Design a protein around this ligand. Structure first.
Ligand SMILES: Cc1cn([C@H]2C[C@H](O)[C@@H](COP(=O)(O)OP(=O)(O)OP(=O)(O)O)O2)c(=O)[nH]c1=O
Ligand SMILES: Cc1cn([C@H]2C[C@H](O)[C@@H](COP(=O)(O)OP(=O)(O)OP(=O)(O)O)O2)c(=O)[nH]c1=O
Ligand SMILES: Cc1cn([C@H]2C[C@H](O)[C@@H](COP(=O)(O)OP(=O)(O)OP(=O)(O)O)O2)c(=O)[nH]c1=O
Ligand SMILES: Cc1cn([C@H]2C[C@H](O)[C@@H](COP(=O)(O)OP(=O)(O)OP(=O)(O)O)O2)c(=O)[nH]c1=O
Ligand SMILES: [Mg+2]
Ligand SMILES: [Mg+2]
Ligand SMILES: [Mg+2]
Ligand SMILES: [Mg+2]
Ligand SMILES: [Mg+2]
Ligand SMILES: [Mg+2]
Ligand SMILES: [Mg+2]
Ligand SMILES: [Mg+2]
Lengths: 481, 481, 481, 481
């Protein structure tokens, strides 16, 4: 019936239009309260207890802020209340498809358990939004508030996942192109979802955040680029834009890709793999499903949250023992031991289909060191991490349009050379982390010898503690000294 | 094994001595990651996702800070490393006893389920600590770090719950009395646990803290009082002390006793009660326990967390339907409707024994108005809340010792009218909230009539929205105009 | 001309309409950059470097925010862009009248150097605003942006100082009455000026602000009260409102009325007095003015800032020696020694005309102790502090109008009994601070004896350190022990 | 006399040893209250009201923190309380030499007014420190607290300015080398002064700092490096170290080198140059000094603060007209207009000796466009900014020693390719800003054409607004498109 106010630690008092409230107060949406934003990060950063729910509220809020500011500054855009509401809904709903421990689920588990399926949290969000709409009688409520469900649900879905297949969108015409750059920006990745997670993750992790999203909003316009209306930034802000991505990278460096956080996600993933044959999730009409198969019945996926972790942990079924045991090790803090980090040198990259063979390479290395123990490929974990600016090898700022103070409608491009010589010369790189599942002193020592030798053989970068953990290995490599 | 550093958003970088690390990395301690600090409050303040774990870490840290500060200011106290470690363990482990949704469990659920016991989270903490130590071989580690297991474990337990059974403490002599004022202060309620939850809860709720604990720590000495060495605050800090309690009250007013948060705690408690006979928790020996009986076996209690909620929410068994459905109504936000709030006048108390009778009273009222429906006692909930400065009717500052800059070692007293005339004249009061389980317009209107009439009959305070929700009724009471 | 954006640490990015910019970029306005918000408080709280300027910007911003909120929720109020601009201007300009060290000037210096005049910073703001307008050709700029200079200028002035003397305002009719409640609220003291100095002062002092003005703004409506459209708060907010004043009180208790900050304001005022005959400030037509007379010519007052402190301090003129030596004594931190604080009892109210008679009394007391050093009137300083809720003895909340969610257009009243019984019973009290200019040890002892015996004789409250600084005096007064 | 506690908004409650207090309570130190940290920055960022005084307290506090931490973690360094006091005094006093508006004075004014002298704020701080010691009888107070003035004063001065001209330090031997790395680090620039100004400047500017100095302090050790004991950072902090410098750079781009802030510093400088003949400052023995000569007499320098600004602003002397007017144009916000920014390409670097030749070059340019007005040299201003990581063209991280977890006493080196490929390739660049003193639309158009043409002639980078301000010029430079 009426609008609600929600007090958020990041944004303060957020006003929710009654339709938004209607969408939020569904099992499908409330489900997100039981899925941590940073998954295993919480097991390293105790302040990171926040879940996808509050993040989603923040995203909807910011989407609303940006679209409203745009409309207010430029009424000639003909942004309607319908547009605002659809953008807010998209913002609210683009996190619906996330599984247990967020990125652990779609980044590690699903690719291993369902390697044939090309699953994404975006598609999950579309399906789950469709299921929310259909299971909660949302359409009549949308019509009640002036929305046209066919068009507008199309538009929302497209905001989340892109064109459901020349102007490729069906939800809105070309003159409203800019609206697709708010919730999930496919062009350059500058969107409100990022802003909310910068602020929220920072607030909870104990890290200060360098990015001023409000400033950005106050310096954003719509201009015509390539006969298309796009969101443009004030030229002045180019530095701040570069910094934004820097921030992202920093956050991945300090927290998101923290080696222990990652190894914990890995262990939880192993536990899930070992529990997958014995865990039942009742889906549609009593039809049972698995952790790996919950993602193809939305009624089952709705009940697939962080809860799984605890179910496994609290089980008494002998068939779950192994899985249980793994989780229990996490509780005792008997984790796989981090052995080190290294990088490719020069031009060479590491292809995905090679990942599987990496622990064999390490185990096959021949360090000239005396060792009683002997490790095997299955004792090693090799985690390859692609760090980039969101557009693989490309500089996303080259895909941003700017405007000058004297011609606010004239879109211009700004090159990296026009800003600073102190900026990154590359926008993508790979970090290779090595862990060992054997945790005793001698095993960790051997693992270090194998690892550093492996780095030398592949002509990879010298590990930072190389001279310390493998003093007999490192001065074989002239390139390292 | 070495010290570990943990980054906390409240305290920053916290150092953990390896013994503390050993204690934390047990299932008994890690359990606290799965119990929300503010419970149902998370459903009103979406920022309040924080759990008892991070709060406990915070408490241990602050305990350490206080004892170290005292030690460094006054070497004559003979505060030892052992003392410091024991105080830190006491701070870390004094939240071990909380159950699912924290205070929902010891404050609502347990007194209803098993009204014949006197369960407290303190006792739970002692039992849980005992269980953690015994189940994890912590004693030999304790002596590895120069602790004496018998008397130090006694000392820790005593810091948690007070005298187990004249100087009543067996863990420490009276010349170390001040140590017992740090973790859980029975004398005046001024301890580090409060400080942590002030800062942390404020940080997550999105409301701001006003108490400066670091300042207090700065101006804290140990001075002699009534045969005892006790913690004394510098005189001019007295204002700040009153304010401290004022903050606590404020926190209860805005957040901890939020009408909706409380009614959600209520609905969840009811769901647990209706689920109690069917949820089995496997404890020691493989023996089966229930939610209400897990507190009798620490092995089962270890597995008693917020997960229950989801276990009830995700269930399929008919015997759980009535529980399950309740939780589902929380997801659809079909909550019991808040009817209103009133207070008793004079020095008129409402003892606990009368609580259960209050719903009947409201329904037995005679509103001289048309009513389309008649409500029964079982349609009403009367939640009565005691707001006080932590020592029932007493002024806790009357139990604080102070010192002046002219004589640092000399304890003194400061009376209330020696500070300000603007302070509360009382230090305890009662709030009466009334809800209606029937939600329809007509039943809610009727409920408002019944309620206001019930306020008039018992000469309770006039509901702020009295003239608006029952204009045919408030004229009868001439004291209300 | 276009609007400008200013980044403020409190409010973030605030927009300024070109008219406000034109008003700001004048010598009369920029003047405020050189006057400390907290005067001598900076010599106690090193973070409190902030000046009246930035505060003024904040006040204008918040005024704009509140009026926009009101207008966007209730279009039936017909709030024009003119109204918004005029409210913003009043917000910006209501600090123009402040003198050197802010409240030290109108609160100490002026009343002592010119006892016959009735000078307030508000009237000063009016005169300075008029001077700004006339000196800077602002009227046609106002016209350029749609303002009607005569009534709008009257309106702005009325918002600042009140009626320039049935409905007593010429600027706006009664149906825009609520507009007069935003910048300077004569009705209950709840205005945006308070909100800015709460947030800002707390930011700089290192004390934390617990009042949430954004929340208040979100919950504010305009309702009919005795045929007058007025600003009404949501019922639920009442507690927060009480707290808002409590906060004010706290900020006075901790910082604004800090004993050393006040005695420093006293020494500065004293020095300004002793310099008043000799300092020349050139005004209109080259005519020369004093410090105490600069308030008569706005051209001279424009040049009267904190700079005076440094003129005196840096001076070499023998005629200024006496003043100079005082400021230098502040630099060496040889301040008058604080003897203590006490309060009247029962019904006593130290009236202003009796203030001068206070050092005589203290110096007169016969404490009957061994007394190797006798002291006199001009050795003592007695400062009387009136702590209240901004409406003398009255409860400001009784002058606040509320609304309920069931009938948002229906204004109601709420009494203190409808809220809490932990609230204050008095809303005004007095504090008596005694210092001694004789800083040596024996003199200090003496002054303590004098002061305590004086408190006993006047039936004042027993000083907190009483039983330490006057051991042979405090056991006499039987109502003390 | 005893220890004092000071509440600072950045650090909270700082303890100051009585000796430090004696040093602080001097006109030479208190002088820093009247000098703004960011100078002209205040006129762009209204939050930047903070002064050198509070910053100095901050630096002393942090120096103390780092030395204490080092001493607590590593007893074998034999750090004495004498060392702690000397490092605190150095940190406290290393900003004593700053002049009016800080870096405007030593960076702009002095070089233009006294090109024949080498002047630095470091030399000024040493001089002012000696003056402080000699004017306030500090030596016997130093001796009173266990200091040895002859060697300790040398130690402090050495910490501030470096070797007074094989171990080149006299204050402390090589085994205390690490002590010189705290207050002002000549080796790599990582010192507590930076940490304080990061935190403080950010707090006041309304910018957010992502450098965690506390974390750095916790992971700092002293290890042997080349027969010295030096501060070593834990290996994995290397990323953070890079980020620290990145932060510095960011702070320079957003705030310290704000083009308007710089042009305001330039206008103030020009005003001082035009006032130098006439303003008099009375130093030792009544002798008179100019602003440019005050640095030759510490007694006069003690009176040289931001006050002169106001003096010039408030003067009636016709000889000061030209100075005064400029300041007046600052108040009216009639500033020199910003034409634009460019950068040298290739290897080319601009030396100071070429600066004055730059405005001549811009006016000597020939844009092939119809101009209505001819501009000359005096109409142009060229500001050259050097942006580096504190060590000219070098990577300061190549001058950081690290330590690994497994061998905490063994110092190692970490190269850039060992960390990230996304790091800067250069560590220095130049920014060239061009402004025009004539502010009419015509002269501005002309100036734009001149500037872009000049940029093209010297193969500089294409201005970001190039295609907009000069459409007839940018298509001529093939190197741009
Ligand atoms: C600062 C503050 C925040 N909040 C937060 C908690 C909620 O997220 C948000 C909304 O709470 P409420 O304002 O209490 O809204 P309500 O739904 O409980 O009451 P009603 O329907 O009658 O209007 O505000 C308070 O409730 N009280 C406060 O004093
Ligand atoms: C600011 C910051 C905090 N943190 C937090 C997260 C952790 O809670 C805490 C611990 O530091 P860690 O780097 O996580 O220590 P570690 O145990 O992973 O590595 P090691 O065993 O080699 O010492 O620091 C970072 O990890 N990185 C950062 O840059
Ligand atoms: C975060 C941030 C704030 N600010 C603040 C400082 C100012 O108070 C406010 C406005 O500064 P600018 O945005 O730089 O505006 P400008 O007037 O200098 O330039 P232009 O006229 O071309 O638009 O923004 C920045 O300038 N840059 C930043 O990166
Ligand atoms: C929060 C808070 C800070 N502060 C700050 C301001 C000061 O910078 C710092 C020290 O103030 P005080 O504690 O008041 O020290 P004092 O010198 O005035 O009193 P005394 O000599 O008798 O001990 O603490 C308070 O004074 N009071 C407060 O309640
Ligand atoms: Mg509600
Ligand atoms: Mg994305
Ligand atoms: Mg099937
Ligand atoms: Mg570790
Ligand atoms: Mg307690
Ligand atoms: Mg007022
Ligand atoms: Mg003092
Ligand atoms: Mg430096």
């Amino acid at each position: 019936d009426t609008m609600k106010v929600i007090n958020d630690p990041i944004h303060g008092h957020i006003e929710l239009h009654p339709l938004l409230v209607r969408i939020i107060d569904t099992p499908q949406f409330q489900r997100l309260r039981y899925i941590k934003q940073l998954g295993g990060g919480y097991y390293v950063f105790p302040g990171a207890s926040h879940n996808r729910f509050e993040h989603s509220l923040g995203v909807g809020y910011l989407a609303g802020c940006l679209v409203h500011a745009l409309g207010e500054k430029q009424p000639e855009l003909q942004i309607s209340e319908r547009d605002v509401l659809c953008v807010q809904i998209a913002g609210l709903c683009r996190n619906l498809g996330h599984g247990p421990f967020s990125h652990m689920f779609d980044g590690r588990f699903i690719p291993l358990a369902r390697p044939e399926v090309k699953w994404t949290h975006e598609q999950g969000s579309v399906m789950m939004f469709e299921h929310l709409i259909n299971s909660n009688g949302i359409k009549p409520v949308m019509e009640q508030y002036g929305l046209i469900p066919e068009e507008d649900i199309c538009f929302i879905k497209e905001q989340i996942v892109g064109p459901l297949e020349l102007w490729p969108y069906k939800g809105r015409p070309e003159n409203k192109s800019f609206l697709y750059e708010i919730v999930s920006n496919k062009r350059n990745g500058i969107d409100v979802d990022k802003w909310d997670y910068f602020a929220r993750d920072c607030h909870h992790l104990g890290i200060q955040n360098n990015f001023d999203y409000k400033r950005f909003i106050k310096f954003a316009r719509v201009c015509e680029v390539d006969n298309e209306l796009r969101i443009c930034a004030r030229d002045k802000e180019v530095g701040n834009l570069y910094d934004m991505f820097h921030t992202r990278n920093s956050l991945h460096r300090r927290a998101y890709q923290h080696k222990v956080g990652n190894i914990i996600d890995t262990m939880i993933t192993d536990a899930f793999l070992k529990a997958d044959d014995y865990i039942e999730i009742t889906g549609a009409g009593g039809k049972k499903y698995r952790i790996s198969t919950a993602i193809d019945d939305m009624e089952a996926y709705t009940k697939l949250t962080d809860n799984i972790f605890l179910e496994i942990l609290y089980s008494t079924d002998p068939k779950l023992k192994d899985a249980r045991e793994i989780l229990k090790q996490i509780e005792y803090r008997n984790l796989f031991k981090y052995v080190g980090e290294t990088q490719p040198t020069g031009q060479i990259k590491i292809k995905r289909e090679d990942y599987e063979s990496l622990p064999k390479e390490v185990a096959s290395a021949k360090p000239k060191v005396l060792l009683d123990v002997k490790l095997k490929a299955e004792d090693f974990i090799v985690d390859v991490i692609n760090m980039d600016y969101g557009m693989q090898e490309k500089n996303p700022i080259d895909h941003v349009s700017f405007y000058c103070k004297t011609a606010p409608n004239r879109a211009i491009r700004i090159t990296k050379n026009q800003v600073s010589q102190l900026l990154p010369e590359k926008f993508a790189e790979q970090l290779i982390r090595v862990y060992c599942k054997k945790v005793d002193r001698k095993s960790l020592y051997a693992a270090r010898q194998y690892f550093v030798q492996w780095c030398a053989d592949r002509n990879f970068t010298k590990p930072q503690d190389g001279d310390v953990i493998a003093p007999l290995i490192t001065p074989q490599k002239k390139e390292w000294n």
